[PDB]
mmCIF file of C-alpha atoms and ligand atoms in Angstrom:
data_model
loop_
_atom_site.group_PDB
_atom_site.id
_atom_site.type_symbol
_atom_site.label_atom_id
_atom_site.label_comp_id
_atom_site.label_asym_id
_atom_site.label_seq_id
_atom_site.Cartn_x
_atom_site.Cartn_y
_atom_site.Cartn_z
ATOM 1 C CA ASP A 7 75.010 335.981 83.508
ATOM 2 C CA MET A 8 72.421 338.718 82.888
ATOM 3 C CA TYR A 9 72.884 342.014 84.701
ATOM 4 C CA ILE A 10 70.894 345.185 85.392
ATOM 5 C CA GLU A 11 71.883 348.902 85.093
ATOM 6 C CA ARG A 12 69.815 351.830 86.374
ATOM 7 C CA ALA A 13 68.103 353.859 83.491
ATOM 8 C CA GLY A 14 66.036 356.463 85.434
ATOM 9 C CA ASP A 15 63.206 357.373 87.806
ATOM 10 C CA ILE A 16 59.600 356.376 87.163
ATOM 11 C CA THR A 17 57.696 359.673 87.101
ATOM 12 C CA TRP A 18 55.067 361.219 84.818
ATOM 13 C CA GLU A 19 56.621 363.877 82.537
ATOM 14 C CA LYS A 20 54.633 367.055 81.832
ATOM 15 C CA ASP A 21 55.100 368.026 78.171
ATOM 16 C CA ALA A 22 56.075 364.569 77.034
ATOM 17 C CA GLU A 23 55.728 363.894 73.255
ATOM 18 C CA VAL A 24 52.221 362.692 72.575
ATOM 19 C CA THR A 25 51.773 359.975 69.843
ATOM 20 C CA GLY A 26 50.307 356.584 68.887
ATOM 21 C CA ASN A 27 46.713 355.531 68.019
ATOM 22 C CA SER A 28 44.059 353.578 70.038
ATOM 23 C CA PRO A 29 42.992 350.445 68.025
ATOM 24 C CA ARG A 30 40.304 348.103 69.344
ATOM 25 C CA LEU A 31 41.339 344.543 68.428
ATOM 26 C CA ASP A 32 39.793 341.021 68.946
ATOM 27 C CA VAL A 33 42.759 338.952 70.260
ATOM 28 C CA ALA A 34 43.459 335.424 71.570
ATOM 29 C CA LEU A 35 46.096 334.499 74.180
ATOM 30 C CA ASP A 36 47.616 330.946 73.907
ATOM 31 C CA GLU A 37 49.214 328.808 76.695
ATOM 32 C CA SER A 38 52.705 329.925 75.612
ATOM 33 C CA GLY A 39 51.800 333.677 76.324
ATOM 34 C CA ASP A 40 51.565 334.572 72.647
ATOM 35 C CA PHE A 41 48.875 337.021 71.528
ATOM 36 C CA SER A 42 47.289 336.586 68.035
ATOM 37 C CA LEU A 43 44.598 338.465 66.010
ATOM 38 C CA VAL A 44 41.088 336.894 65.916
ATOM 39 C CA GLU A 45 39.232 337.433 62.614
ATOM 40 C CA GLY B 7 73.659 345.534 94.496
ATOM 41 C CA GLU B 8 71.695 348.593 93.462
ATOM 42 C CA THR B 9 68.225 348.268 95.040
ATOM 43 C CA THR B 10 67.068 351.880 94.405
ATOM 44 C CA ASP B 11 63.467 352.094 92.980
ATOM 45 C CA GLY B 12 63.421 352.959 89.253
ATOM 46 C CA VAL B 13 63.661 351.579 85.761
ATOM 47 C CA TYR B 14 66.572 349.338 84.760
ATOM 48 C CA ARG B 15 68.016 347.875 81.527
ATOM 49 C CA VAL B 16 68.469 344.091 81.502
ATOM 50 C CA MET B 17 71.884 343.280 79.811
ATOM 51 C CA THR B 18 73.772 340.127 78.662
ATOM 52 C CA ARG B 19 77.420 339.523 77.659
ATOM 53 C CA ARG B 20 76.600 336.076 76.241
ATOM 54 C CA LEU B 21 76.087 337.430 72.692
ATOM 55 C CA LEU B 22 78.260 339.958 70.685
ATOM 56 C CA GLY B 23 79.381 342.871 73.027
ATOM 57 C CA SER B 24 76.911 343.936 75.692
ATOM 58 C CA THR B 25 73.358 343.533 74.353
ATOM 59 C CA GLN B 26 70.203 344.923 76.012
ATOM 60 C CA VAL B 27 67.612 342.077 76.089
ATOM 61 C CA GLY B 28 64.969 344.060 77.995
ATOM 62 C CA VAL B 29 63.976 346.415 80.865
ATOM 63 C CA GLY B 30 62.421 346.176 84.332
ATOM 64 C CA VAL B 31 61.075 347.963 87.399
ATOM 65 C CA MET B 32 62.575 347.914 90.873
ATOM 66 C CA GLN B 33 59.915 348.685 93.476
ATOM 67 C CA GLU B 34 59.792 347.874 97.175
ATOM 68 C CA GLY B 35 62.973 345.684 96.860
ATOM 69 C CA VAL B 36 61.469 343.556 94.024
ATOM 70 C CA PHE B 37 62.633 343.539 90.341
ATOM 71 C CA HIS B 38 59.735 343.115 87.837
ATOM 72 C CA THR B 39 60.206 342.223 84.204
ATOM 73 C CA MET B 40 58.650 340.121 81.410
ATOM 74 C CA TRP B 41 59.293 336.363 81.288
ATOM 75 C CA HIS B 42 60.490 336.446 77.629
ATOM 76 C CA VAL B 43 63.346 338.880 78.664
ATOM 77 C CA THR B 44 65.125 336.596 81.222
ATOM 78 C CA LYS B 45 63.481 333.170 80.613
ATOM 79 C CA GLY B 46 63.433 332.976 84.435
ATOM 80 C CA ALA B 47 67.283 333.101 84.737
ATOM 81 C CA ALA B 48 69.076 334.698 87.793
ATOM 82 C CA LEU B 49 70.186 338.289 87.460
ATOM 83 C CA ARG B 50 73.291 340.206 88.669
ATOM 84 C CA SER B 51 73.254 343.726 90.203
ATOM 85 C CA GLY B 52 76.811 344.878 90.712
ATOM 86 C CA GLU B 53 78.241 342.104 92.899
ATOM 87 C CA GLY B 54 74.754 341.009 94.209
ATOM 88 C CA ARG B 55 72.515 338.222 92.905
ATOM 89 C CA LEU B 56 68.723 338.475 92.224
ATOM 90 C CA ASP B 57 66.893 335.169 92.253
ATOM 91 C CA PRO B 58 63.500 334.609 90.644
ATOM 92 C CA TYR B 59 60.632 334.478 93.101
ATOM 93 C CA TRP B 60 57.463 334.159 91.007
ATOM 94 C CA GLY B 61 56.802 333.799 87.291
ATOM 95 C CA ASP B 62 54.221 332.710 84.725
ATOM 96 C CA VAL B 63 54.865 332.118 80.996
ATOM 97 C CA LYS B 64 51.206 332.710 80.034
ATOM 98 C CA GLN B 65 51.031 336.157 81.753
ATOM 99 C CA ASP B 66 54.710 336.606 80.441
ATOM 100 C CA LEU B 67 55.740 338.103 83.808
ATOM 101 C CA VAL B 68 58.458 337.360 86.454
ATOM 102 C CA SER B 69 59.485 338.968 89.811
ATOM 103 C CA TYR B 70 62.863 338.685 91.652
ATOM 104 C CA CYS B 71 63.650 338.845 95.496
ATOM 105 C CA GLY B 72 59.910 338.869 96.379
ATOM 106 C CA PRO B 73 56.330 338.714 95.192
ATOM 107 C CA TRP B 74 54.906 340.915 92.358
ATOM 108 C CA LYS B 75 54.304 344.430 93.929
ATOM 109 C CA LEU B 76 52.767 346.423 91.016
ATOM 110 C CA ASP B 77 48.928 346.658 91.314
ATOM 111 C CA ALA B 78 47.826 349.937 89.711
ATOM 112 C CA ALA B 79 45.420 349.549 86.767
ATOM 113 C CA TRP B 80 44.660 351.707 83.654
ATOM 114 C CA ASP B 81 41.369 353.463 84.432
ATOM 115 C CA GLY B 82 40.016 352.805 80.919
ATOM 116 C CA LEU B 83 39.703 356.551 80.033
ATOM 117 C CA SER B 84 42.931 358.501 80.591
ATOM 118 C CA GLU B 85 46.128 358.956 78.614
ATOM 119 C CA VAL B 86 49.150 357.079 80.013
ATOM 120 C CA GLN B 87 52.990 357.314 79.508
ATOM 121 C CA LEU B 88 55.243 354.601 78.165
ATOM 122 C CA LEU B 89 58.583 355.112 79.874
ATOM 123 C CA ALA B 90 60.580 353.675 76.981
ATOM 124 C CA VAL B 91 64.175 352.560 77.576
ATOM 125 C CA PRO B 92 65.458 351.536 74.122
ATOM 126 C CA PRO B 93 68.836 349.762 73.641
ATOM 127 C CA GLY B 94 71.739 352.255 73.732
ATOM 128 C CA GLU B 95 69.326 355.211 74.100
ATOM 129 C CA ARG B 96 68.244 357.435 76.952
ATOM 130 C CA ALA B 97 64.934 356.714 78.842
ATOM 131 C CA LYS B 98 62.147 358.828 77.325
ATOM 132 C CA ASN B 99 58.447 359.353 78.303
ATOM 133 C CA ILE B 100 55.816 358.938 75.502
ATOM 134 C CA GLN B 101 52.271 359.958 76.180
ATOM 135 C CA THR B 102 49.399 357.983 74.461
ATOM 136 C CA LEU B 103 45.723 357.012 74.728
ATOM 137 C CA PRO B 104 45.643 353.254 74.918
ATOM 138 C CA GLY B 105 43.493 351.180 72.657
ATOM 139 C CA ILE B 106 41.936 347.847 73.738
ATOM 140 C CA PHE B 107 42.652 344.069 73.351
ATOM 141 C CA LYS B 108 39.259 342.375 73.564
ATOM 142 C CA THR B 109 39.615 338.683 74.658
ATOM 143 C CA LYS B 110 37.236 335.836 75.499
ATOM 144 C CA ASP B 111 38.291 336.383 79.147
ATOM 145 C CA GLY B 112 37.836 340.179 79.206
ATOM 146 C CA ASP B 113 39.420 343.373 77.893
ATOM 147 C CA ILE B 114 42.941 344.643 78.348
ATOM 148 C CA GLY B 115 44.474 348.114 77.636
ATOM 149 C CA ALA B 116 46.962 348.229 74.705
ATOM 150 C CA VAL B 117 49.578 350.776 73.549
ATOM 151 C CA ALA B 118 50.276 351.252 69.882
ATOM 152 C CA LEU B 119 53.944 352.226 70.000
ATOM 153 C CA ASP B 120 56.779 350.437 68.127
ATOM 154 C CA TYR B 121 60.192 350.077 69.764
ATOM 155 C CA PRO B 122 63.105 347.566 69.381
ATOM 156 C CA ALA B 123 62.636 344.107 71.026
ATOM 157 C CA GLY B 124 65.106 344.985 73.843
ATOM 158 C CA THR B 125 62.680 347.676 75.045
ATOM 159 C CA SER B 126 60.344 344.834 76.446
ATOM 160 C CA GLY B 127 59.711 345.328 80.189
ATOM 161 C CA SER B 128 59.548 349.181 79.955
ATOM 162 C CA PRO B 129 56.845 350.475 82.365
ATOM 163 C CA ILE B 130 53.537 352.101 81.469
ATOM 164 C CA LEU B 131 52.495 354.755 84.066
ATOM 165 C CA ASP B 132 49.391 356.676 85.120
ATOM 166 C CA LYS B 133 49.359 360.458 86.020
ATOM 167 C CA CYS B 134 50.354 359.624 89.655
ATOM 168 C CA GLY B 135 53.584 357.909 88.431
ATOM 169 C CA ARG B 136 52.230 354.449 89.342
ATOM 170 C CA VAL B 137 53.164 351.460 87.109
ATOM 171 C CA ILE B 138 49.981 350.099 85.536
ATOM 172 C CA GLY B 139 51.810 347.438 83.528
ATOM 173 C CA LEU B 140 54.822 346.469 81.347
ATOM 174 C CA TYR B 141 55.349 346.920 77.591
ATOM 175 C CA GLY B 142 56.448 344.180 75.239
ATOM 176 C CA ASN B 143 53.968 341.338 74.766
ATOM 177 C CA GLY B 144 51.511 342.030 71.913
ATOM 178 C CA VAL B 145 50.732 341.598 68.265
ATOM 179 C CA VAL B 146 51.547 342.842 64.707
ATOM 180 C CA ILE B 147 48.407 344.256 62.925
ATOM 181 C CA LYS B 148 47.634 344.527 59.102
ATOM 182 C CA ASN B 149 49.859 347.708 58.446
ATOM 183 C CA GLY B 150 52.793 345.808 60.046
ATOM 184 C CA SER B 151 52.764 348.013 63.135
ATOM 185 C CA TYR B 152 53.194 346.773 66.716
ATOM 186 C CA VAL B 153 50.514 346.950 69.441
ATOM 187 C CA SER B 154 51.544 345.878 73.032
ATOM 188 C CA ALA B 155 49.205 344.776 75.796
ATOM 189 C CA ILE B 156 49.441 346.797 79.033
ATOM 190 C CA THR B 157 50.531 343.607 80.996
ATOM 191 C CA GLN B 158 49.942 343.814 84.775
ATOM 192 C CA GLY B 159 50.501 341.112 87.451
ATOM 193 C CA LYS B 160 48.468 340.352 90.634
ATOM 194 C CA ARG B 161 49.677 341.749 93.976
ATOM 195 C CA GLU B 162 48.901 338.844 96.437
HETATM 196 N N1 LIG C 201 58.539 346.049 67.216
HETATM 197 C C1 LIG C 201 59.451 344.927 67.298
HETATM 198 C C2 LIG C 201 58.917 343.709 68.142
HETATM 199 C C3 LIG C 201 58.800 344.028 69.591
HETATM 200 C C4 LIG C 201 58.640 342.999 70.546
HETATM 201 C C5 LIG C 201 58.493 343.348 71.880
HETATM 202 C C6 LIG C 201 58.553 344.648 72.266
HETATM 203 C C7 LIG C 201 58.688 345.594 71.276
HETATM 204 N N2 LIG C 201 58.841 345.366 70.003
HETATM 205 C C8 LIG C 201 59.905 342.555 67.886
HETATM 206 C C9 LIG C 201 59.043 341.371 67.507
HETATM 207 C C10 LIG C 201 57.903 341.907 66.832
HETATM 208 C C11 LIG C 201 57.607 343.255 67.537
#
């Protein structure tokens, strides 16, 4: 039996840590919901 | 059970100890997560039971107690926040400018942030605090880093 536990509110935080890049990728989505890279 | 709006961890006692298999969003009485987190199984909230209502393996999404309620979309220009809820760690907001997944059926926003597998289902938000999608279904690129789609359902 899976169970859920509250972890917090959903709100935008001012002064949150800013990170991560913004890649543009050609991708394919199969019938099983799996994404793969297209080259 | 606890029906307060917010972000929740999805836990299981089937494996060793209590393991976090994912995360989800409770909004308007409906629990929203990714299909690969629960595989469509029923969930427990205290002494209450949450039954699946809608789900789709290809979209990799599932809703409990009612239809999918989340309909905000990334505007294609602004920074967003991943409200990451990692296993055994406190919820933390991470701001990022999404990249793009280009598909034969159109383009999708994508966030290049790497977290443990049990973080799947963590919400991605806009500046109004609205959930524009869930984190956790994506791809691994050349450098071995993870890039997740910003996966959003359809509000009927
Ligand atoms: N970065 C670890 C992985 C993941 C999956 C879903 C969500 C977040 N991280 C596990 C499988 C490969 C990528």
